[PDB]
Design a protein around this ligand. Structure first.
Ligand SMILES: [Zn+2]
Length: 186
């Protein structure tokens, strides 16, 4: 995490450990629990607007340093699951929704996957800018994350890739998010 010259940091809609809820954020754990394939409106905040060309990248990494050096990718199952949108490659975990200019990358050196989008200042009347994400594999998929916790890294970079700000949050993709938030909230 690191707010830069722009005060870059993330924001989340408070939903509640209720039921029928498909996505809820836990301020205490700073962890998100969401159902697979459902939209998560994460917010972007800044005290100054980034220069034009600045982008927003979303990468998933493993929380525990023992698995730190392993690329997070969908499990052999979901990988062979026809549930694409026409943009995201079948092997990516984090997809973006709503944006018409998302870019799906794979670092040539680290092999890590990411989704980058153009940074856009908040629309009139809002104080923050939204980006709808989705996870396409459950935390409990064998071959996949396999019960291993992950952390979503959201970085604000300039047109040329330079880091301009970074923030993160742990995430859990489950069928029972609400329950899992409270029965973990402790
Ligand atoms: Zn899976």
């Amino acid at each position: 995490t690191y707010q830069g010259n722009y005060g870059f940091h993330l924001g989340f809609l408070q939903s509640g450990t209720a039921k029928s809820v498909m996505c809820t954020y836990s301020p205490p754990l700073n962890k998100l629990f969401c159902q697979l394939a459902k939209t998560c409106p994460v917010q972007l905040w800044v005290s100054a607007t980034p220069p034009a060309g600045s982008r927003v990248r979303a990468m998933a990494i493993y929380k525990k340093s023992q698995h730190m050096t392993e690329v997070v990718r969908r499990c052999p199952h979901h990988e062979r699951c026809s549930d694409g949108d026409g943009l995201a490659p079948p092997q990516h975990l984090i997809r973006v929704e709503g944006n018409l200019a998302p870019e799906y990358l794979e670092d040539r050196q680290t092999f890590r996957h990411s989704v980058v989008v153009p940074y856009e200042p908040p629309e009139a009347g809002s104080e923050y800018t939204t980006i709808h994400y989705k996870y396409m594999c459950n935390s409990s998929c064998m071959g996949g994350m396999n019960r291993r916790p992950i952390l979503t890294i959201i970085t604000l970079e300039d047109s040329s890739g330079n880091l301009l700000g970074r923030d993160s949050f742990e995430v859990r993709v489950c069928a029972c998010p609400g329950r899992d938030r409270r029965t973990e909230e402790e």
